[PDB]
Amino acid sequence: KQLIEFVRWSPERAQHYRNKGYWIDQPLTRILTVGVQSHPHSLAIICGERQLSYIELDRLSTNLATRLAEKGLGKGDTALVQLPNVAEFYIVFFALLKAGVVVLNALYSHRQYELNAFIKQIQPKLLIGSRQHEVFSNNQFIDSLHDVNLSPEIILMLNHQATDFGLLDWIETPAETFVDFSSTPADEVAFFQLSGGSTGTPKLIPRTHNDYDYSVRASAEICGLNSNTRLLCALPAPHNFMLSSPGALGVLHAGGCVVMAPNPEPLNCFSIIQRHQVNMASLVPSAVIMWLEKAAQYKDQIQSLKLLQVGGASFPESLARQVPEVLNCKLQQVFGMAEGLVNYTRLDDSDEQIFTTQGRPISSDDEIKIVDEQYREVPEGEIGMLATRGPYTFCGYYQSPEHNSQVFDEDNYYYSGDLVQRTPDGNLRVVGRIK
Numbered sequence: 001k002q003l004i005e006f007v008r009w010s011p012e013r014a015q016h017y018r019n020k021g022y023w024i025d026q027p028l029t030r031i032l033t034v035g036v037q038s039h040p041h042s043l044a045i046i047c048g049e050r051q052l053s054y055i056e057l058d059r060l061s062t063n064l065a066t067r068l069a070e071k072g073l074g075k076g077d078t079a080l081v082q083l084p085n086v087a088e089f090y091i092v093f094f095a096l097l098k099a100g101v102v103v104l105n106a107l108y109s110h111r112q113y114e115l116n117a118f119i120k121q122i123q124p125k126l127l128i129g130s131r132q133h134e135v136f137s138n139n140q141f142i143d144s145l146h147d148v149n150l151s152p153e154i155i156l157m158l159n160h161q162a163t164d165f166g167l168l169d170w171i172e173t174p175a176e177t178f179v180d181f182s183s184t185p186a187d188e189v190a191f192f193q194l195s196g197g198s199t200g201t202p203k204l205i206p207r208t209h210n211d212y213d214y215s216v217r218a219s220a221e222i223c224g225l226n227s228n229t230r231l232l233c234a235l236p237a238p239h240n241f242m243l244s245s246p247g248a249l250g251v252l253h254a255g256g257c258v259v260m261a262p263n264p265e266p267l268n269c270f271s272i273i274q275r276h277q278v279n280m281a282s283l284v285p286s287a288v289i290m291w292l293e294k295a296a297q298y299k300d301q302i303q304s305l306k307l308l309q310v311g312g313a314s315f316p317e318s319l320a321r322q323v324p325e326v327l328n329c330k331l332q333q334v335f336g337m338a339e340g341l342v343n344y345t346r347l348d349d350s351d352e353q354i355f356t357t358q359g360r361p362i363s364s365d366d367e368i369k370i371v372d373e374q375y376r377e378v379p380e381g382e383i384g385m386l387a388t389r390g391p392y393t394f395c396g397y398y399q400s401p402e403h404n405s406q407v408f409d410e411d412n413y414y415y416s417g418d419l420v421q422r423t424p425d426g427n428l429r430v431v432g433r434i435k
């Protein structure tokens with residue numbers, strides 16, 4: 001009965017964000033429902049040989065949701081999902097969104113240590129993972145859970161064993177008895193994002209349907225997504241950048257197709273790009289340099305590529321200028337954070353803007369302060385700490401009133417710890433970090 005707790009925006013702000021049409025009060029599933037009504041047979045996912053259409057994606061994720069409700073998981077429950085870059089990730093994500101189950105999506109690279117702490121924190125009634133992952137190689141982690149009574153009622157395994165509840169069987173066939181389910185309401189938590197800004201253990205970021213959906217819709221527009229967009233998805237699927245900036249979700253919103261890739265390794269990606277005439281990709285700087293090393297020898301395989309976003313870590317101008325000359329596609333720079341705020345260079349910005357800056361916020365209403373060691377705004381152009389609040393920036397980590405009071409100010413701006421400067425045209429330049 002009790003929905004997951006989070007820190008809310010003020011009602012003044014809630015109202016403003018509905019008034020400007022940012023918050024339209026639909027569930028994240030809107031992406032899918034709308035997609036089914038316009039183009040049920042367009043490709044939504046390409047994963048090696050497989051092709052999932054929008055209605056295939058809608059049907060399969062309905063199956064699993066009915067199947068989970070049958071076992072009485074729904075509004076109030078939480079779930080821990082750990083899945084590699086395969087179509088099942090999205091099927092599952094939609095399933096839980098439809099079910100009303102608030103999900104935390106673990107990175108596949110996360111090991112016992114992190115999975116344990118997430119479990120302790122959100123106490124899932126559902127766990128989903130892969131028998132091919134070192135942690136579910138055998139049973140030591142699962143049995144371990146029994147001994148602290150953090151055992152999930154239900155556990156699904158991809159690449160399951162015979163005595164496992166297989167994920168694929170739960171996706172493939174709908175439940176015998178019909179139980180009722182819906183999404184969490186739109187101004188309540190849809191799921192948990194994770195910070196990359198953390199010492200060791202990632203802090204949990206509640207995101208609501210309203211704020212996430214808005215970030216996705218607005219991002220699709222800033223990047224000019226449309227139904228011909230075919231977006232390579234080589235970064236970890238649950239990462240905010242890859243999910244929503246504009247991400248799988250952005251592409252789904254625009255009626256395009258996501259193209260799966262296990263990781264960002266060049267030869268494998270280059271030839272996934274070739275096979276599916278991928279026209280859009282998203283990478284972090286260390287992966288950009290790998291592609292840069294092999295692109296001249298494979299000019300032919302990667303021509304179809306029209307846009308590459310780079311975000312996630314400092315990106316020297318030196319390398320930025322190489323993207324168009326070497327990768328043969330437009331560059332867009334992205335500076336975002338799981339916590340909220342995302343900045344894009346625009347497609348109509350100048351050469352210099354795009355090579356030397358990390359763009360400007362999604363929303364005219366992303367409010368921004370750049371401040372000095374004593375919390376005063378700095379002179380324009382100077383370097384200070386970024387502080388921000390907006391229509392899609394969280395208002396606290398899950399169940400951490402102590403850390404929250406350290407990283408928010410009286411007026412509810414959030415402090416990322418990034419050192420920025422505003423440029424004379426209006427974009428941001430990420431210059432550093434501070435504790």
Ligand SMILES: Nc1ncnc2c1ncn2[C@@H]1O[C@H](COS(=O)(=O)NC(=O)c2cccc(O)c2O)[C@@H](O)[C@H]1O
Nearest residue numbers: 196240241245311312313314334335336337338416430
């Ligand atoms: N373009 C950038 N240049 C320099 N630093 C960056 C940049 N982008 C992110 N960072 C650092 O990474 C931190 C954010 O870490 S996260 O993992 O939460 N998210 C992302 O990384 C993320 C990147 C691009 C688009 C997105 O939507 C994202 O969510 C920021 O506080 C920055 O310190």
Ligand SMILES: [Ca+2]
Nearest residue numbers: 051052053056
């Ligand atoms: Ca199909």
Ligand SMILES: [Ca+2]
Nearest residue numbers: 303304305328
């Ligand atoms: Ca090209």
